[PDB]
Structures are given as structure tokens and as C-alpha cells.
């Protein structure tokens, strides 16, 4: 989808 599922998950790894 858009960036906020890939910043979801990174979230955790940023």
C-alpha cells in the first residue's frame, strides 16, 4: 500500500 505500513513495521526497526 502506501508508506504507512512500510513505517509501521520500520517503526520497529528505526
Known sequence: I???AL???AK???
Open 2 to 4: 502506501n508508506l504507512k
Open 12 to 14: 520497529k526497526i528505526l
Open 7 to 9: 513505517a509501521a513495521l
